[PDB]
Design a protein around this ligand. Structure first.
Ligand SMILES: *[C@@H]1O[C@H](CO)[C@@H](O)[C@H](O)[C@H]1NC(C)=O
Ligand SMILES: *[C@@H]1O[C@H](CO)[C@@H](O)[C@H](O)[C@H]1NC(C)=O
Ligand SMILES: *[C@@H]1O[C@H](CO)[C@@H](O)[C@H](O)[C@H]1NC(C)=O
Ligand SMILES: *[C@@H]1O[C@H](CO)[C@@H](O)[C@H](O)[C@H]1NC(C)=O
Lengths: 56, 170, 57, 57
């Protein structure tokens, strides 16, 4: 289940931004940091809860 | 790119205002005048503190050509304006020409502007407008700044010291 | 249009060339005209699309 | 739109380079010259492989 739940990352590799696209860069960065913190949170939380549940 | 500038200034922790072209000695053949009525100070007609609205002197507005070399370790924010008169007669009045343009170049960009004269709805008692433009000049970079009229030249351009956690709130 | 200006010298040049591009759809035609300052295409290319690919440094 | 082009090329798995207007026969009244000093090849002044800097003839 844990393995099946992840969606293989056939997604954007990365993007470059111009000098006058700082808000777009920051939006992209916010999106990446947001998703990264959410998935780090979910990945670690899933593992911590599943590990506690597994040991229980 | 006002919204972009607000974002660039959001990470500035401090800056150094510099005189870039501050005096009659920087501008011996141009003067600072033009419409001041709507940017008054304590009831007196006036102009922006960090910008020099240049008009011709003694009937002339010589091709303007100035440059600034960023011989500092910091990035320099340079603001400029371009004047867009309400009428052709108001451009001629400042000794700017019909074929006026502003050309700003640095090692990483070039932008050319022309006036767009038009009657506008009157805002703050003005039928014309001034557009404002800007760039961040990297250390060691140079801006070559030219005009054939309608130029509002920089003054108190500034060095940016960057940091984080800062920003703009209302 | 050209924007002639003195630039800071970069790689020994005081001028510049801007680069522009388009993706032409099958059956589409590009009409290409100039009165000077044109750097014409050569080795334009057909694109075969796929996924999972991208650019990394 | 360099950043946009980098994105368009990110999904290209392959391509076919075509001569579009490759020769003097495509350009009988234009030639390829102009400043080549800064795009040298092994010390010789030159021009981009996929672009023809045309000047008058
Ligand atoms: C002002 O104009 C005179 C006469 O054309 C010229 O010699 C002088 O260099 C100009 N000043 C500056 C700073 O360019
Ligand atoms: C400053 O704001 C006041 C708001 O009451 C306005 O009346 C005045 O004209 C403004 N002055 C300038 C120079 O913007
Ligand atoms: C080259 O110029 C001649 C003379 O104007 C003209 O007849 C000929 O068609 C031109 N070549 C091409 C490919 O247009
Ligand atoms: C290629 O890169 C080298 C880096 O040392 C540089 O000296 C040379 O001028 C470059 N040549 C071209 C055609 O860009």
């Amino acid at each position: 289940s844990v393995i099946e739940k992840m969606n293989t990352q056939f997604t954007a590799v990365g993007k470059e931004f111009n000098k006058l696209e700082r808000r777009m860069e920051n939006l992209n960065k916010k999106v990446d940091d947001g998703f990264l913190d959410i998935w780090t949170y979910n990945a670690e939380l899933l593992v911590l809860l599943e590990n506690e549940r597994t040991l229980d | 790119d006002y919204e972009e500038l607000r974002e660039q200034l959001s990470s500035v922790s401090s800056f150094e205002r510099f005189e870039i072209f501050p005096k009659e000695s920087s501008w011996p053949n141009h003067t600072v005048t033009g419409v001041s009525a709507s940017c008054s100070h304590n009831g007196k007609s006036s102009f922006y503190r960090n910008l020099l609205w240049l008009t011709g002197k003694n009937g002339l507005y010589p091709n303007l050509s100035k440059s600034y070399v960023n011989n500092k370790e910091k990035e320099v924010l340079v603001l400029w304006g371009v004047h867009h008169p309400p009428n052709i007669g108001n451009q001629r009045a400042l000794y700017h020409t019909e074929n006026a343009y502003v050309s700003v170049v640095s090692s990483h960009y070039s932008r050319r502007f022309t006036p767009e004269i038009a009657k506008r709805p009157k805002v703050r008692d003005q039928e014309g407008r001034i557009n404002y433009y800007w760039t961040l000049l990297e250390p060691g970079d140079t801006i070559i700044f030219e005009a054939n009229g309608n130029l509002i030249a920089p003054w108190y351009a500034f060095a940016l010291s960057r940091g984080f956690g800062s920003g703009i709130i209302t």
